[model samples]
Target: PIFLNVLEAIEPGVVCAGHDNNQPDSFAALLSSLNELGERQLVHVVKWAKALPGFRNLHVDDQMAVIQYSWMGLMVFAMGWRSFTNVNSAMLYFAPDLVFNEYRMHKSRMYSQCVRMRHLSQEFGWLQITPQEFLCMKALLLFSIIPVDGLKNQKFFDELRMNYIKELDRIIASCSRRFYQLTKLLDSVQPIARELHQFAFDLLIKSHMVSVDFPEMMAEIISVQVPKILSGKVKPIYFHTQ
Candidate 1:
């Protein structure tokens, strides 16, 4: 088998020391097992590397680069999987690689979108905005409509706000769930697979960094009773039933 071949290949390097010195052979065995395991899973590893959302979406040259650098991540994921089933622990190492690759992909797409949006904005004289700026504008729009004045009586408005927030939560949750699924698929051969399963829950918490703080501040702002004491920026516009 592959293990035997590996042992044969490395056997010449093994040297005997004094009694109780089997370190060289032990090291060689570890290397042999690693090689054998890698060979056995070679096809699945290649398939997963190619199928990764970030890797597959890259240009051919970029794809090759990612795959080459990703060997470390693959090995780590495999080792971690064998050591602990905690998906989050596995992902703590792997997710950063995926996130970095995805960020690069996003940058490329955003560059294209910026070019297109710049032309469109120029055509209409709309203020030029980056994707992040656009997101901030959208958040402002949501903030503008959510009623803060006497909100206890505005059940419909509150419901609308809740629905909007919940939709955002759902989107964040879905992305996290997908991340875990992808990690599990990639690291299935690891013995500690069960530990890796909680990745989605951890990811969900990680993804809510902004939303978590914003809502608390929003709640505090909305609870103020004095109208004059409220900043002009905090005033609610007229609400309409839909």
Candidate 2:
């Protein structure tokens, strides 16, 4: 009931939008909400980054780099947990005004992937995840680093990545069935997370919630790792079903 209680106190999206059709949203207030979202997200991601032992030993800039690279996926992970906040309603409530209504979203410019990501998250709850398992996910997300330009510490981070997986293996070794379930969970986010990133970008852009010069956190939302071309060729896209 803890999550239910918290969610109930927050008003729904329809109510918020109705409050001031007068203004739609003022530029000042809209930016506040946007930046506030980014700030709050930073708190959550930084907390996740700080929790891992190998994560703590890195250089300060490298640590920030980890957060920058991983935060969007971590954010989608956070959103999955949040989907449980109002399961019956089928909403993703980042804020009252920013709440997502599943039935109406796709009709708008919102990405189609959210329909599946939203449901997958609800299915995530059916797994009966433990707190330890959640922490393990936090570590894995933090360690899932792509090759960033001028990032010279790939070997070091690779060790951290394996260490996190080693720890995940330990937890799974104690429970046989959960091993299969959790591995499936790992594969589950692949396509939907890409959808989520696109949806977030679309939401921010369409809503005009972004700043002229993007703040660091906002930049991470839109930044993606493009693979180095072999000679000159485009990479494959996540267009079809997974």
Candidate 3:
């Protein structure tokens, strides 16, 4: 109850992507707004994560590192839920002003990834996930990704991860079918995030040519933090063998 209370208390309110609908859809314009949205969400995510129960127990360095590594998955998962609830899984609700329709999906140059996200959004309704279950699972996601070399304080990381898992277990109480389904959905978030990470990285490298503008923080994360995952330095902990 306490943990859920904290989760509910700290959950971020709606974050809009400040996209201009007046502009004709173009790759540069769409991506620029998405980068802006990512930067905005990162600010909220950092505050929300710091408020998580026992999060401050980890080393200060590990705290920032984990947030950097897991932010993509965290945002993607929440975005999926928003799409499910608001649009009935009809489109990608990245933010209030930044929903992705079929045409925008194609124009964004991330059609394949957007399709996968839509499917993930559909899974929420198919699985009958409750708000509490979503909150617990989202918290668990914070501990899902780490460097293959481990965090500076791996001991504390493991303990925190285990505690979050216990909380999720408590939320579900008992159900193998539901447990398996929920875990599979959690594991599925990684691949979608991986695709986005790659797309963002490549775009960053040639951003000038593409006319895509990445904000300072988003650029730093994509350039520095994200390279670890792309280079096999960081890896996601999966529930099932890959």
Candidate 4:
């Protein structure tokens, strides 16, 4: 109950994308607002991660590195949960104001990825994942990706990661088969996140031509942190192998 209490207490409040959705859906506008939404969510994500149990035990540099490497998956995972809870997985809910309907999904130029995200949202309901499990699994995501060269405190990182896994196990008690399904679901997030990462990276690179905009924070992370993952400098720790 202590771990659940901590996770629930640290959960972030609702975030809005501040998108003006009345206007016709354009690739530039949709992506721009999504970028802004990403920036906003990131502010809360850093604070939330810092507040996690045993998070501060890692080297300070490792903290930042892991978050940077895993932010996309974290956002996508949370967004799927949000979409599930809010719209019944009928759409991609990036924020309260930035829900993606089928048309918007097509216009956003990431229909395939959007489809994948919607499926992920549906899984939350299919698996009947509780809030506690969601909270713990989301926390695990922070520790799921890292630089292959190792963190400044890889040992500490490993220990913290192990403990988080234990917390998830405790939360799911006596359900070994459910653990397999849950882990498979977690593993599913990476491929979807990877595609979005690649899409966001390309969009950032040619943003000028496409008339898309990236906020300063989103631009920085997309250009710097995300590239490291795409280039294999950073990699996700998967529960299952391909």
Candidate 1: tens digits of C-alpha lDDT, residues 176-238: 654343323223212221121122123224434522121332222223311222333223322
Q: What are the lDDT scores of the predictions, listed in order?
A: 0.30, 0.54, 0.94, 0.91
Tell me the TM-score of model 3. Answer: 0.98
Q: Once superposed on the true structure, which residue ranges of model 1 sit more than 4 Å away at CA?
A: 1-25, 86-242
lDDT for position 242 in model 2 = 42
Query: How far off is model 3, as Cα RMSD?
Result: 0.8
Off by over 4 Å in 2: 1-36, 85-89, 95-98, 148-150, 174-177, 199-216, 220-242
Tens-digit lDDT string for candidate 2 (1-242): 33223223321222132223234544444444545565566665676466556666776767776676566566666567656554532776544556656433543334366676576667667887665665576457665545334345766776777776777777565375676677667556645655555555555455543432336656554543211211112111211224
- TM agreement with the true structure for every prediction: 0.26, 0.64, 0.98, 0.98
* lDDT of residue 116 for candidate 2: 64
Error of 2 at 194 (Å): 2.5
Indicate which candidate wins on lDDT. 3
**Each candidate's root-mean-square deviation in Å?**
25.6, 8.0, 0.8, 0.9
Model 3 residue 74 lDDT? 98
Candidate 4 local distance difference test against the native = 0.91
Q: Which tens-of-lDDT digit does each residue in 114-207 have in candidate 4?
A: 9999999999999999988999899999988888889998998888989999999999993989899999999999999999999999999999
lDDT of 2: 0.54
Q: List runs of model 4 lying over 4 Å from the truth.
A: none
Give the number of colliding residue pairs in candidate 2.
0
